[PDB]
């Protein structure tokens, strides 16, 4: 028992982290096989970030200008190319620590672990979720760019995020491993405000099932609701509309606990309307939305 | 910017996890050099846990009865001994992945990362704190025993916890790496209720400084207090008494923000007396106490 914001073990990703330097800018890179992936803003100076022309900036850069260091050893750069907002540095050596891996573009609401890095060195790991407005509420300082988000399915690492920037609102934006930004963000130091950060309803319900599984049951009530009635409440509280796909994905949790999805929705409805009244659920005084139904099952069953 | 419950990168610990089986019981072991450390209750059957005589149970066990598997390869056991509540299995091979390490017995209030394991395989990593009542609020299922807690200072892993049991209250108890339980708990399936779980005041103050550093300042007020006045409030709210050692340890955070420790105490006093009024601090609706002043500085400065 017990429920924690748990991240995947980071070892497989740690063995991929390298330091990439170009001119006077140093950030993190991801070394998989004979390719190093890093944010293209590594070629920029502070003056360039105002409105950079990455194609024109990359013309003045040769393979020898990209310094790639893995631990204390220097990798030899034999090719460089830009794919969207990432640079792919072909090195002469395949990473001997390359795990089985995939590049996946996640959907908003999905979760992933982040290995925060500085100068190619890991500092920590934490669990995140892609917000419905395509930002992530991370913990990153200057030099953390190139740090990646990922999920692990037994031995396969699915890289889904690469950190690129911090918005003036303190929230984070980045790309998938093909260099495509999540959301409308551009890799430019400009006015970029995030949209409405709605609550991931399916995740809150999954976390409510996790609470019941771990003994916290005070919020269970004698009521039920319908998808349309629940969604009227969810709209009022800036919660994502619940769909039959969401109900279907909560099936195993509903089966495990014996609490119908719509009954759990009615508990959530009353919690939205009446608040927690000074009470807590799984050590939290607010409704947690960064655990997917998959995460709850995984943690409550011990998937390694 | 941003503040997260961040764990240490787990790679160095993952390379130490092995599976230990004795009879029909399988749990995790920690392989460092040529020794495997695991909870001594591995020699018990379900019937034995009611009141086990570990010395008498260990007499019927020989080196060949302890099956130690690292990945898919079997380690040869050449010695076995009991140190307090841990078993030390001498193997014929030093772990090639042994990092620089220490065994440390932490104080209540200190934090550490846990690598939850099952059958010698890591499932996840999360940040924990030793509660003042010597329990930890973890996330562990049957088979997680032998999973360890640790801290990392650059390249050195300081192992501080080994998971042994779950109390009927759903909280967790375990030992340091010398086999000594934190708190009064015994490795026996008996009535063991935890003491009062007080709030780690110095950590809440450190987290309040983290909030100011990251932009959340609404809770700052025009007041100050004294250590004795603050402690009258802390006693009423089951908070640990604040000492001059605690004030001293919060010195760097006070210096960074320019907010005197006693002024921050006065903000905490008003938050205890008036609550959050439906507001949040660093995405939490309650006062977070599982970040030490060291953790806040580390995260806010990017120590790798
Ligand atoms: C203090 O800087 C950070 C803190 C956290 N995460 C990331 C950063 N870095 C930046 O945001 C910055 O280098 C930048 C500016 C404009 C566009 C891009 Br692309 C990148
Ligand atoms: C479901 O079991 C768990 C869940 C989480 N963490 C640990 C366990 N295991 C136990 O508590 C159990 O093997 C036991 C019983 C009595 C004394 C000892 Br020592 C160990």
XYZ file of C-alpha atoms and ligand atoms in Angstrom:
648
model
C 0.000 0.000 0.000
C 0.844 3.731 -0.226
C 0.701 5.924 -3.342
C 3.555 8.029 -4.662
C 4.357 10.208 -7.666
C 6.778 7.586 -8.963
C 9.172 7.998 -11.830
C 10.689 5.236 -13.983
C 14.189 4.058 -12.969
C 16.496 6.457 -14.851
C 19.590 4.266 -15.470
C 18.860 3.494 -19.115
C 18.534 7.236 -19.833
C 21.540 8.290 -17.689
C 23.806 6.199 -19.960
C 22.603 8.312 -22.946
C 23.235 11.788 -21.497
C 26.070 13.784 -23.034
C 27.156 17.438 -22.966
C 26.953 19.403 -26.199
C 28.743 22.731 -26.589
C 28.648 25.075 -29.524
C 30.508 28.333 -29.231
C 29.777 29.627 -25.747
C 26.490 27.656 -25.236
C 26.450 24.331 -23.402
C 23.367 22.128 -23.073
C 22.452 18.419 -22.874
C 22.306 15.938 -25.692
C 20.850 12.442 -26.008
C 23.302 9.871 -27.431
C 21.548 6.850 -29.025
C 23.443 4.601 -31.471
C 25.807 6.956 -33.447
C 23.577 10.044 -33.188
C 23.414 12.822 -30.589
C 20.102 14.680 -30.336
C 19.996 18.163 -28.868
C 17.954 21.418 -29.081
C 18.958 23.463 -32.123
C 19.136 26.644 -29.995
C 22.629 25.315 -28.955
C 23.954 27.269 -32.029
C 22.504 30.548 -30.683
C 24.064 33.338 -28.703
C 21.867 35.320 -26.221
C 21.454 38.037 -28.901
C 20.367 35.422 -31.500
C 17.398 34.126 -29.400
C 15.393 37.346 -30.004
C 14.544 36.182 -33.572
C 17.007 33.504 -34.769
C 17.279 32.310 -38.362
C 18.438 28.789 -37.550
C 19.194 27.882 -41.179
C 21.463 30.958 -41.542
C 23.078 30.304 -38.116
C 23.757 26.638 -38.964
C 25.598 27.673 -42.236
C 28.403 29.183 -40.109
C 28.753 25.858 -38.168
C 30.895 22.859 -39.125
C 31.154 19.387 -37.479
C 34.213 20.503 -35.486
C 32.207 23.372 -33.851
C 29.952 20.898 -31.969
C 31.783 19.644 -28.905
C 30.209 16.434 -27.628
C 31.530 14.971 -24.398
C 30.236 11.732 -22.791
C 31.544 11.688 -19.198
C 35.144 12.851 -19.598
C 35.646 11.551 -23.175
C 35.225 13.462 -26.394
C 33.045 12.151 -29.224
C 34.086 12.803 -32.808
C 31.376 14.595 -34.870
C 31.206 13.307 -38.479
C 27.852 14.844 -39.529
C 25.288 17.421 -38.496
C 21.731 18.077 -39.599
C 18.684 19.922 -38.390
C 15.338 18.133 -38.082
C 12.646 20.657 -37.081
C 13.927 22.146 -33.696
C 16.517 19.435 -32.953
C 20.059 18.937 -34.170
C 21.272 15.410 -34.964
C 25.019 15.116 -34.573
C 26.360 11.997 -36.202
C 29.280 10.713 -34.109
C 31.892 8.076 -35.112
C 31.012 5.808 -32.136
C 27.741 4.052 -31.281
C 26.802 4.538 -27.599
C 27.641 1.182 -25.955
C 24.968 1.954 -23.334
C 22.185 2.482 -25.942
C 19.046 0.776 -24.608
C 16.169 -0.586 -26.762
C 14.362 2.664 -27.656
C 11.553 4.366 -29.583
C 10.650 7.991 -30.295
C 7.011 8.657 -29.482
C 4.909 11.819 -29.667
C 2.621 11.720 -26.619
C -0.918 13.061 -26.281
C -1.877 15.756 -23.723
C -2.823 14.107 -20.411
C -0.180 11.373 -20.733
C 2.559 11.149 -18.127
C 6.345 10.608 -18.342
C 9.484 10.779 -16.235
C 12.074 13.558 -16.716
C 15.771 13.168 -16.041
C 16.896 16.761 -15.369
C 20.503 17.211 -16.536
C 23.195 19.968 -16.493
C 26.452 19.777 -18.505
C 25.490 16.201 -19.542
C 25.162 15.126 -15.877
C 21.941 13.941 -14.250
C 20.701 15.902 -11.232
C 17.330 14.247 -10.617
C 14.271 12.435 -11.824
C 10.584 13.301 -11.429
C 7.204 12.375 -12.885
C 5.464 14.897 -15.208
C 2.386 15.102 -17.430
C 1.908 16.801 -20.759
C -0.685 19.459 -19.848
C -3.774 19.864 -22.074
C -2.251 23.261 -23.109
C 0.969 21.320 -24.175
C 3.240 22.761 -21.484
C 4.821 20.736 -18.654
C 5.203 21.931 -15.071
C 8.801 20.860 -14.625
C 11.825 21.901 -12.601
C 14.518 23.195 -14.879
C 17.176 25.875 -14.677
C 19.500 27.437 -17.346
C 21.599 24.583 -18.785
C 18.811 21.959 -18.419
C 17.882 22.155 -22.150
C 18.202 18.822 -23.902
C 17.015 16.952 -20.749
C 14.498 14.289 -21.888
C 11.145 12.840 -20.905
C 10.448 9.136 -21.343
C 8.438 6.058 -20.412
C 9.751 2.466 -20.016
C 8.012 -0.732 -21.163
C 10.124 -3.522 -19.518
C 13.409 -3.029 -21.501
C 12.328 -0.429 -24.113
C 12.714 3.327 -23.491
C 10.127 5.463 -25.319
C 11.574 8.981 -25.483
C 8.753 11.486 -25.728
C 10.074 14.886 -24.682
C 13.187 17.041 -24.982
C 13.259 20.197 -22.916
C 13.800 23.447 -24.854
C 12.448 26.471 -22.990
C 10.854 28.178 -20.083
C 7.956 30.525 -20.746
C 7.742 33.806 -18.743
C 4.980 32.070 -16.710
C 7.546 29.567 -15.302
C 6.095 26.630 -17.253
C 8.048 24.506 -19.676
C 7.901 23.834 -23.424
C 9.764 21.397 -25.578
C 9.657 18.989 -28.435
C 9.214 15.294 -29.257
C 12.513 13.544 -30.419
C 11.753 14.515 -34.048
C 12.146 18.201 -33.015
C 8.443 19.079 -33.215
C 7.266 21.290 -30.333
C 4.304 20.197 -28.306
C 1.775 23.000 -28.671
C 2.202 26.267 -30.526
C 5.537 27.246 -29.002
C 8.486 28.374 -31.094
C 12.195 28.231 -29.999
C 12.400 31.978 -29.772
C 12.625 34.423 -26.838
C 9.271 36.033 -27.553
C 5.793 36.623 -26.007
C 4.448 33.124 -25.702
C 1.615 32.753 -23.271
C 0.128 29.339 -22.595
C -3.553 28.559 -23.087
C -5.981 27.478 -20.370
C -4.477 24.740 -18.242
C -7.446 22.412 -17.798
C -7.535 19.481 -15.347
C -7.040 15.963 -16.775
C -10.357 14.454 -15.646
C -9.583 10.802 -16.575
C -6.372 11.023 -14.468
C -8.165 12.518 -11.443
C -10.659 9.588 -11.621
C -7.789 7.106 -11.912
C -6.203 8.747 -8.801
C -9.568 8.496 -6.962
C -9.587 4.717 -7.738
C -5.957 4.587 -6.422
C -7.236 6.268 -3.238
C -9.989 3.655 -2.759
C -7.454 0.804 -3.423
C -5.171 2.282 -0.727
C -7.876 2.824 1.932
C -8.899 6.499 1.510
C -12.667 6.146 0.996
C -14.290 9.152 2.780
C -15.204 10.791 -0.574
C -17.352 7.869 -1.768
C -20.983 8.879 -1.807
C -24.468 7.418 -2.395
C -24.813 9.143 -5.798
C -24.374 8.499 -9.470
C -24.383 10.753 -12.555
C -24.391 10.540 -16.407
C -21.548 11.525 -18.812
C -23.505 14.637 -19.962
C -24.400 15.706 -16.362
C -20.810 15.152 -15.176
C -19.457 17.112 -18.189
C -21.623 20.128 -17.298
C -19.768 20.187 -13.915
C -16.381 19.481 -15.572
C -16.878 22.467 -17.946
C -17.663 24.790 -15.028
C -14.499 23.689 -13.170
C -12.152 23.745 -16.262
C -11.873 19.978 -16.307
C -11.429 18.073 -19.587
C -14.718 16.618 -20.902
C -14.977 12.907 -20.076
C -15.610 10.618 -23.089
C -16.651 6.955 -23.434
C -12.951 6.256 -24.373
C -11.993 7.588 -20.894
C -14.721 5.446 -19.221
C -13.400 2.410 -21.194
C -9.771 3.076 -20.108
C -10.978 3.259 -16.454
C -12.607 -0.219 -16.866
C -9.874 -2.224 -15.082
C -9.917 0.212 -12.108
C -13.713 0.072 -11.965
C -13.509 -3.785 -12.095
C -10.820 -3.989 -9.382
C -12.740 -1.771 -6.901
C -16.317 -2.634 -7.865
C -17.137 1.090 -8.203
C -18.828 1.964 -11.536
C -17.062 4.790 -13.447
C -20.183 7.009 -13.309
C -20.451 6.464 -9.528
C -16.824 7.632 -9.183
C -17.714 10.605 -11.449
C -20.495 11.511 -8.953
C -17.955 11.438 -6.096
C -15.705 13.749 -8.221
C -18.700 16.007 -8.975
C -19.418 16.452 -5.229
C -15.698 17.076 -4.520
C -15.659 19.769 -7.225
C -18.857 21.371 -5.884
C -18.065 21.104 -2.132
C -14.266 20.951 -1.964
C -12.287 18.717 0.415
C -13.571 20.467 3.636
C -10.045 20.454 5.073
C -9.613 16.720 4.397
C -6.938 14.970 2.301
C -6.835 12.138 -0.270
C -3.583 10.151 -0.653
C -1.762 12.866 1.320
C -2.962 15.617 -1.053
C -5.388 18.485 -0.290
C -6.223 18.946 -3.996
C -7.371 16.648 -6.806
C -4.248 15.065 -8.378
C -4.296 14.783 -12.181
C -0.761 13.581 -13.089
C -1.442 9.806 -12.707
C -2.959 8.077 -15.793
C -5.183 4.945 -15.355
C -2.146 2.978 -16.658
C 0.111 4.489 -13.943
C -2.361 3.582 -11.197
C -2.608 -0.055 -12.354
C 1.210 -0.241 -12.788
C 1.918 1.112 -9.293
C -0.854 -0.883 -7.621
C 0.377 -4.160 -9.309
C 4.188 -3.633 -9.181
C 5.207 -3.705 -12.846
C 8.999 -3.873 -13.222
C 12.052 27.707 -12.252
C 9.434 25.168 -11.074
C 9.641 22.932 -7.992
C 9.255 19.168 -7.996
C 9.544 16.255 -5.578
C 12.732 15.107 -7.292
C 14.539 11.869 -6.680
C 18.228 11.131 -7.323
C 19.035 9.413 -10.649
C 18.687 5.697 -9.818
C 21.224 4.102 -12.222
C 23.960 3.525 -9.653
C 21.463 1.682 -7.420
C 19.774 -0.258 -10.271
C 23.129 -1.947 -11.018
C 23.159 -3.271 -7.402
C 19.674 -4.829 -7.320
C 19.503 -8.616 -7.212
C 16.799 -11.182 -6.411
C 17.245 -13.310 -3.309
C 15.181 -16.454 -2.772
C 15.167 -18.724 0.222
C 12.746 -21.605 0.230
C 9.487 -20.217 -1.113
C 10.205 -16.518 -0.244
C 11.637 -14.129 -2.825
C 12.675 -10.552 -2.058
C 15.282 -7.980 -3.165
C 18.916 -7.845 -2.218
C 21.595 -5.171 -2.559
C 24.825 -6.421 -4.187
C 27.881 -4.275 -3.292
C 31.411 -5.674 -3.757
C 31.164 -9.452 -2.918
C 28.284 -9.104 -0.435
C 24.510 -9.235 -0.920
C 22.425 -7.464 1.725
C 18.812 -8.446 2.254
C 16.123 -8.520 5.006
C 16.569 -11.541 7.270
C 12.825 -12.324 7.056
C 13.732 -13.953 3.654
C 14.316 -17.190 5.703
C 10.735 -17.087 7.057
C 7.591 -18.812 5.928
C 4.200 -17.037 6.446
C 3.692 -19.135 9.620
C 7.154 -18.116 10.944
C 6.417 -14.329 10.834
C 4.003 -14.577 13.810
C 6.976 -14.842 16.238
C 10.151 -15.955 14.408
C 13.331 -17.081 16.147
C 15.724 -15.949 13.429
C 18.777 -17.603 15.013
C 16.963 -20.984 15.132
C 15.595 -20.497 11.573
C 19.052 -19.612 10.202
C 20.546 -22.889 11.683
C 18.486 -24.900 9.156
C 19.909 -22.768 6.263
C 23.138 -23.379 4.338
C 24.843 -21.228 1.636
C 23.208 -23.301 -1.120
C 19.683 -22.451 0.213
C 20.097 -18.740 -0.681
C 19.449 -18.281 -4.379
C 20.907 -14.992 -5.594
C 20.242 -13.971 -9.176
C 21.560 -10.749 -10.796
C 19.573 -10.248 -14.024
C 19.458 -13.754 -15.496
C 22.744 -15.001 -13.952
C 23.191 -16.929 -10.746
C 25.624 -15.788 -8.053
C 27.487 -18.393 -6.028
C 26.970 -18.015 -2.233
C 30.166 -18.762 -0.248
C 29.126 -17.344 3.160
C 26.114 -16.172 5.120
C 25.758 -14.197 8.324
C 23.131 -12.227 10.162
C 23.824 -8.655 11.277
C 20.854 -7.371 13.315
C 17.807 -7.673 10.879
C 19.829 -8.063 7.660
C 21.493 -11.065 6.082
C 24.889 -10.638 4.401
C 25.435 -13.230 1.706
C 29.050 -13.444 0.674
C 29.187 -14.215 -3.059
C 32.233 -15.382 -5.094
C 32.019 -12.378 -7.482
C 32.360 -8.653 -6.764
C 29.573 -6.633 -8.446
C 31.277 -4.987 -11.455
C 28.664 -2.205 -11.239
C 29.449 -1.390 -7.559
C 29.477 2.409 -7.222
C 31.429 4.392 -4.571
C 29.199 3.857 -1.510
C 28.654 4.410 2.217
C 26.157 3.071 4.754
C 24.598 5.900 6.732
C 21.955 5.928 9.464
C 19.809 9.009 8.796
C 18.037 11.239 11.310
C 14.233 11.747 11.309
C 13.323 14.644 8.993
C 16.029 13.782 6.444
C 15.002 12.853 2.917
C 16.118 10.099 0.501
C 15.155 8.465 -2.773
C 13.690 4.929 -2.897
C 14.127 2.539 -5.791
C 11.104 0.222 -5.443
C 12.014 -3.265 -6.702
C 10.260 -6.652 -7.248
C 12.135 -9.911 -7.991
C 15.394 -7.880 -8.187
C 13.914 -5.590 -10.882
C 13.346 -1.857 -10.474
C 9.784 -0.589 -10.914
C 10.180 3.066 -9.933
C 11.868 5.800 -7.990
C 10.404 8.397 -5.620
C 11.514 10.849 -2.945
C 10.739 10.019 0.728
C 11.492 11.377 4.198
C 12.162 9.549 7.424
C 9.158 10.654 9.518
C 9.758 11.923 13.080
C 7.999 8.685 14.241
C 10.636 6.687 12.163
C 8.202 5.356 9.560
C 8.257 6.281 5.851
C 5.180 6.898 3.715
C 6.269 4.817 0.753
C 4.667 2.820 -2.035
C 5.474 -0.827 -1.636
C 3.676 -4.085 -2.299
C 4.462 -7.739 -1.300
C 7.869 -8.586 -2.816
C 9.254 -5.020 -2.429
C 11.267 -5.944 0.721
C 14.971 -5.316 0.312
C 14.293 -2.193 -1.840
C 16.678 0.559 -0.630
C 16.691 4.254 0.180
C 19.719 6.391 -0.633
C 21.224 9.809 -1.292
C 23.951 10.684 -3.858
C 26.870 13.088 -3.344
C 28.326 13.479 -6.905
C 29.659 9.882 -7.401
C 29.100 8.384 -3.908
C 25.872 6.539 -3.004
C 24.962 6.754 0.701
C 22.561 3.878 1.376
C 20.355 4.753 4.320
C 17.280 2.532 4.216
C 16.265 -1.033 3.389
C 12.562 -1.749 3.273
C 11.327 -4.532 5.583
C 7.638 -4.166 6.425
C 4.288 -2.549 6.173
C 2.451 -1.712 9.377
C -1.352 -2.292 9.531
C -1.677 1.519 9.155
C -0.229 1.323 5.592
C 3.028 3.046 6.573
C 6.456 1.552 6.108
C 9.265 0.434 8.427
C 12.755 -0.728 7.707
C 16.363 -0.674 8.685
C 19.659 1.102 7.975
C 22.221 -1.088 5.991
C 23.595 -2.472 9.290
C 20.169 -4.118 9.886
C 19.061 -1.762 12.668
C 15.399 -0.719 12.384
C 14.551 2.936 12.403
C 12.233 3.392 15.369
C 10.916 0.723 17.702
C 9.718 -1.692 15.031
C 10.577 -5.381 15.079
C 10.565 -7.724 11.999
C 7.560 -9.589 13.276
C 3.894 -9.720 12.189
C 2.591 -8.199 15.403
C 0.662 -5.153 16.760
C 2.977 -2.306 15.934
C 1.341 1.070 15.903
C 3.340 4.140 14.951
C 3.697 7.154 17.228
C 2.493 10.677 16.460
C 3.521 11.712 12.973
C 4.603 15.310 13.542
C 5.342 17.803 10.742
C 9.015 18.519 9.932
C 8.990 22.276 10.597
C 12.501 23.046 9.227
C 11.509 21.333 5.929
C 8.220 23.255 5.631
C 10.222 26.517 6.074
C 12.748 25.370 3.469
C 9.797 24.647 1.090
C 8.355 28.130 1.832
C 11.750 29.638 0.795
C 11.581 27.442 -2.379
C 8.127 28.944 -3.022
C 9.439 32.525 -2.728
C 12.430 31.660 -5.031
C 9.965 30.304 -7.629
C 7.502 33.237 -7.514
C 4.770 32.087 -5.076
C 4.798 34.955 -2.553
C 1.133 35.505 -1.499
C 1.798 34.033 1.988
C 4.472 36.601 2.900
C 3.174 38.906 5.585
C 4.146 42.056 7.523
C 4.861 40.083 10.727
C 7.689 38.530 12.645
C 7.850 36.174 15.649
C 10.389 34.685 18.141
C 11.536 31.016 18.405
C 9.549 30.557 21.672
C 6.369 32.228 20.260
C 6.600 30.212 17.022
C 7.147 26.975 19.015
C 3.943 27.569 21.007
C 2.088 27.511 17.624
C 4.161 24.546 16.351
C 3.244 22.510 19.483
C -0.469 23.211 18.979
C -0.292 22.067 15.328
C 1.923 18.944 15.971
C 4.903 20.519 14.266
C 8.465 19.730 15.397
C 9.910 22.425 17.701
C 12.229 24.751 15.769
C 15.762 25.090 17.225
C 18.650 27.511 16.579
C 20.322 24.598 14.635
C 17.289 24.661 12.269
C 17.505 28.492 11.944
C 21.265 28.112 11.190
C 20.622 25.438 8.501
C 18.047 27.799 6.877
C 20.745 30.557 6.716
C 21.602 30.149 3.004
C 17.879 30.245 2.052
C 17.331 33.305 4.240
C 20.422 34.947 2.602
C 19.308 34.092 -0.957
C 15.776 35.540 -0.511
C 16.504 38.318 1.982
C 13.713 37.023 4.259
C 14.841 36.527 7.894
C 14.101 33.012 9.255
C 11.834 34.414 12.008
C 9.883 36.451 9.419
C 9.310 33.231 7.435
C 8.277 31.550 10.733
C 5.622 34.300 11.155
C 4.294 33.557 7.647
C 4.156 29.826 8.639
C 2.429 30.744 11.928
C -0.333 32.638 10.050
C -0.698 29.758 7.539
C -1.103 27.312 10.441
C -3.646 29.569 12.182
C -5.637 30.643 9.073
C -5.055 27.849 6.554
C -4.501 28.381 2.815
C -8.032 29.868 2.179
C -8.382 27.746 -0.963
C -5.015 28.926 -2.326
C -1.971 26.830 -3.301
C 1.819 27.045 -2.820
C 4.076 25.327 -5.394
C 1.032 23.434 -6.711
C 0.192 22.056 -3.242
C -2.857 22.869 -1.065
C -1.052 21.755 2.119
C 2.287 22.581 3.753
C 4.946 20.276 2.222
C 7.503 18.871 4.678
C 9.520 16.340 2.605
C 12.099 18.839 1.204
C 15.113 19.561 3.487
C 16.930 22.966 3.267
C 19.707 21.024 1.448
C 17.202 19.680 -1.133
C 15.840 23.166 -1.821
C 19.327 24.624 -2.403
C 20.309 21.583 -4.545
C 17.213 21.835 -6.758
C 17.309 25.629 -6.994
C 21.066 25.553 -7.984
C 21.149 22.407 -10.202
C 23.618 20.134 -8.409
C 24.545 17.129 -10.567
C 16.643 29.977 -17.487
O 16.460 29.255 -18.707
C 15.761 28.079 -18.659
C 15.163 27.555 -17.524
C 14.447 26.383 -17.666
N 14.306 25.725 -18.823
C 14.899 26.238 -19.906
C 15.639 27.416 -19.896
N 16.210 28.048 -21.023
C 15.555 28.958 -21.782
O 14.352 29.184 -21.680
C 16.371 29.701 -22.837
O 17.700 29.207 -22.962
C 15.646 29.944 -24.145
C 15.108 31.191 -24.432
C 14.279 31.370 -25.529
C 13.995 30.305 -26.371
C 14.584 29.084 -26.108
Br 14.378 27.671 -27.360
C 15.391 28.883 -25.005
C 2.161 -6.810 1.611
O 3.444 -6.828 2.241
C 4.218 -5.703 2.152
C 3.833 -4.518 1.544
C 4.720 -3.461 1.595
N 5.922 -3.516 2.183
C 6.283 -4.670 2.754
C 5.476 -5.803 2.779
N 5.768 -7.015 3.442
C 5.436 -7.261 4.732
O 5.019 -6.397 5.500
C 5.634 -8.686 5.242
O 6.291 -9.528 4.301
C 6.145 -8.786 6.665
C 5.278 -9.088 7.706
C 5.693 -8.988 9.025
C 6.993 -8.607 9.322
C 7.863 -8.366 8.277
Br 9.695 -8.047 8.655
C 7.458 -8.435 6.958
